[PDB]
Structure formats: structure tokens, C-alpha cells
Amino acid sequence: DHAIYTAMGAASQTLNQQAVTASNLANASTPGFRAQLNALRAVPVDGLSLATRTLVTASTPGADMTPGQLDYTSRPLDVALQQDGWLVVQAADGAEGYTRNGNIQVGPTGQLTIQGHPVIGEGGPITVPEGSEITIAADGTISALNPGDPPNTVAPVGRLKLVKAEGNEVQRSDDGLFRLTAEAQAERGAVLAADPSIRIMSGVLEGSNVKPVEAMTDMIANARRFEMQMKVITSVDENEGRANQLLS
Amino acid sequence: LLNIFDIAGSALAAQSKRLNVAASNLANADSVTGPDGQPYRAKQVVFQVDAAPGQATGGVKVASVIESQAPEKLVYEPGNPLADANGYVKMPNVDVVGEMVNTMSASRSYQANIEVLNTVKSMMLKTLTLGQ
């Protein structure tokens, strides 16, 4: 009578896994995206006397840090980081976040943004002089040349804050930015200092890293697992009916 | 025929236990970890005759639930934290077809035992009106 609940848990968590996979597939064109991993954990129910019932719980263990494919766009402000490297932005709630989106934009007032989040440089958010032409070097250095003014007047303005962090040290926040895990925060500090060993390429944008093969295989597996759980539910549903209706 | 009630009840319990084990195995066909971090090893019930005071014929009791000894499947995911020095993650050895067939056969045995118990109870009810 309670195997129906085990099968129902399996089917519901299969639905959750399918939702995760569909959300990953919907962002196949999202610039600088990290796919969410999925794994079904098994929870064994304790008790007496013969432990037979073990339930299923869907989980998302971090994300995927494999870089995607770089689109070469003839623009100086689109940048791509090294493998396992992160650009730093000031998060929505005045905090710090890390990302791979190298689509740096400028405003009328001259401040650099990523998805609207100001970029954080050595001494707090980077601000470029109003209406200047900007070039980004291979180590984060930013040069600004005013339009029409001796090209001998090009001078650096600041340096981007580029950090290095692996998947174990990084957890996705609800606003799409990545942050440090508590166990990584305890060791590497609240704020990560700039890592000078990371090279950055200017003029190339990093796309998403969702793998179509894994997504399609996962969808097929989810469908088949759901059908098997429905069969288990149906088998349990007939037996209980007969039993009660007759042994009364 | 009350011993028949004991027999049928024990057998219903045993077949329900087998069905629950099969359902739990089918749920965990794709499970990669448990609470401790160990792989989920498929469970199998052991049936034994419950005829302790009834000579060689009696009900069926589930002696134990044991992890199947079939070799664990291996998947090459070197980025997985559970991967060993060789990069192989252990996944359960649950056979889908076997579990489906186990569920079906257990259901049929459950229904047969219920019908047996109903017939025996009806026979007892008619015995209650002997000589009248």
C-alpha cells in the first residue's frame, strides 16, 4: 500500500529532473552559461523490521564548468576568460558575484556593466571616461582613447578583477550569478583576490556549454523511467482494491 | 483452518515485501549516491518456510533483505566527486526487466493468496452452520 508512494516519489523526481533538463536546453543560446547537473539520490527509510523501502530525491549538484565555443565578434569589448576563470561583478544586492559573460557594455555616463551589473575593478566598480573608445588587454588592463584626439593619447584606466575558482568552490545563486560556497569561503576568504595567471581574449564571446547528446539521452531516460513508475503504481493500485473489497 | 489464515497472512506479507523491494529497486535504477555517498546496491528478499512447529509445510517468511552481488555498473565521469582514482562512478546493478517481472509475479501471487483466504473464510462460515 506504500509502494505506490515510492513510485510516486520516483515519478515526481523524474518530472523535476526533466524540468532541470528542459531549463538547461532552453539556454542553448545564453551567452556564458553553465549547465545545471542533475542526479537522483537514494534515501533509505530507517525503521523496523526489514528495511525494504528506499525513496528517490532529485538533486542538482553544482553546475558544469566545461567552457563552451567562442564566437569571434569584431568588437573590442566582448571578452572570453581562460578555463576555470571568472569575471567579477557587483551583484544585485550590493554583494559580489562571478560570471563568464564577457559581454561588457558601457553607459552614457561611462560605467561598465555586465547584464546591467557594474564590473568590479581593483578599486571598486570600474568607470570609464564618458564616450571613449575602450580596448581590453590580455590580462585585464583597460585602455581608453577619446574619439578624435592624437592616438598617442591612449592610456590605461584600470584593470579587470579576474579570479580562479573550480566547481567545488562555486555555487549558483538564484539571480544567475555564481558565489563561493561556505566551505570555500572559510578557506579562501570572503573576497577572492585577483589571479594574475589568467589570460583573457578580447573580441570573442563565450556561449553556453549544454551538451545536446546528454540532454537527449536524459530525456529518453526520464520518459522510460516515468513509464516504469506508472506501471508500478498501476500494479499496486489493482492489488489493494482486490484485497480490501474481498477480505472485508 | 485458522492455520490457513496464518499461512495466507504470512504469504501476503511476504509477497507485499517482495513487491516493495522491487518498487524500490525500480525507483533507484538511475540513482548515483545515497546519504553516506555509497552507491545504491539493489535489494533482494529471501523467502524461507515458516513451518517451525508445522513439520515441513507452512507459511513463507522473509528471512532477510540482502544486497545483490551482481557487479556494480561503472560510468566514466572523472569530474564527479564520487569518481575513484580511475575515474569510474559506481551505478546500481538493477535489472529493469527482472524487476518488472518480479512486480507482476508478486502481484499475481498476492491475488491468488487473497482468493485462497476468501475461500477458506467462506468454508469456515459454512462450517459454523453444521447440522442446521
Partner: peptide
């Protein structure tokens, strides 16, 4: 205890945690 038998002491509350 044998399942289906009778005992005067209640069974302990069972739990199924996700992470130890």
C-alpha cells in the same frame, strides 16, 4: 522482534535523511 508479533514497547520514530 518477529514482525506481526505483539510487544509492549512502541517502535521508535523512523526517519529517512538525505545527507548524513
Amino acid at each position: 522482534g518477529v514482525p506481526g508479533a505483539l510487544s509492549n514497547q512502541p517502535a521508535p520514530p523512523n526517519e529517512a535523511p538525505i545527507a548524513t
